[PDB]
Symmetry: C3
Subunit: 117 residues, 3 copies
C-alpha cells in the first residue's frame, strides 16, 4: 500500500518514528505485510481543512484490491482515524482520508511493473 | 473539494493567508461551501514546468460531481487561473491545473466514508 | 507529462539540476517534448519504503495516452529506474513508481482545458 500524509503540524510536532508506526498500522488495517507498506509524511505545510487553518492532516491510501468498496473503506477509515487522532493529538474533525484503488500495470517496481512479477 | 498547490516560490513569496483565500475562491468557483474546501500548499519545492525552472505552480482539484466535464472544467480553469496569476504574481504560462473526480466511497470523514453520511 | 518525486534524501543530497535533467529523461522515455514535461521534487520528507526508513524515493508519472498499458509501462519503468538509481545514488529496492493516465478534460492550461486546445 502507498500512504501519503500532509500536515500543517511542524516536523517537531509529528512524533518521532510516526512513518514506521504507520507501516505497522496499515499492515493490520489493510491486511497486507508491513514490508509492503510505503509511507510519505510531508509536515510544515500551509493547510486549511473545512475552511480552517488550525492543525490538521490529510491521508491518501492507495492499494490493489482492498480500498475499492464503501463497506471496507468504512472499516479502514475507523482504524486510521483512531491511529492518527492519537498520534498527532488531533480531533476527528481535523483529519480527512482519500482512498485510491490501483491496478498492477500502474506500479513500477525493480525496473518493470507488477503485472509481470 | 480538495485543492493541493505545489510551488517553487519560497514560502516568503507566497502571500500570507493564501490557503484561506483559496477556500473562498474555490467555494465561489465550484459552487460548494468554503467550510467544505480543503487546501494544501507546499512551497519551496524544486520544479520545472514546460521544461523551465522559473517560478511556477501546479494545482490539483478533486471533488464529487463538479470536476468531471470539459465544459465546466474550462470555466473552473479560467477562474482559478485569474486567482492564482494575481495572488502568486505568475504569468498564465507558469501554472497548470489537474482535475480529479471523486466518489463518496473514496472520502474518509469522521471514521467512516461519505457513502454513509 | 507530470512527474512528482518525493524523497527522504535532504535537498543537499539531491544533485543540483535534477528537475531539469528529469525533463530531458522523461522526453526520451515517454516520446513527448521536454518543453511539455513538468517535474516537481519534494525532498527532506519522512519516508518508509517497504517498511524501511533508509534513503528512498517515490515517482508518480501522469500523461495522456502513453502510461496506460502494462507493456509500455514496463519499458518506461526500466528507463526511469536507470535514471533515478544513478542520479540519487539509490538501489533499485529503494524506488517505486506509479503511473496515472490522464484525459484532455482533466488538464487546465492557459485558463481553459486541453479538450479545447
Ligand atoms: Na496514496
Ligand atoms: Na480495516
Ligand atoms: Na486534489
Ligand atoms: Na466555475
Ligand atoms: Na504524476
Ligand atoms: Na519507454
Amino acid at each position: 500500500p502507498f500512504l501519503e500524509l500532509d500536515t500543517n503540524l511542524p516536523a517537531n510536532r509529528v512524533p518521532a518514528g510516526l512513518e514506521k508506526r504507520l507501516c505497522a498500522a496499515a499492515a493490520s488495517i489493510l491486511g497486507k505485510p508491513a514490508d509492503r507498506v510505503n509511507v510519505t509524511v510531508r509536515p510544515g505545510l500551509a493547510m486549511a481543512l473545512s475552511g480552517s487553518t488550525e492543525p490538521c492532516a490529510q491521508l491518501s491510501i492507495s492499494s490493489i484490491g482492498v480500498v475499492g468498496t464503501a463497506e471496507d473503506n468504512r472499516s479502514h477509515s475507523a482504524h486510521f482515524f483512531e491511529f492518527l487522532t492519537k498520534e498527532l493529538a488531533l480531533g476527528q474533525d481535523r483529519i480527512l482520508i482519500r482512498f485510491f484503488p490501483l491496478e498492477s500495470w500502474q506500479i513500477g517496481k525493480i525496473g518493470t511493473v507488477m503485472t509481470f512479477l
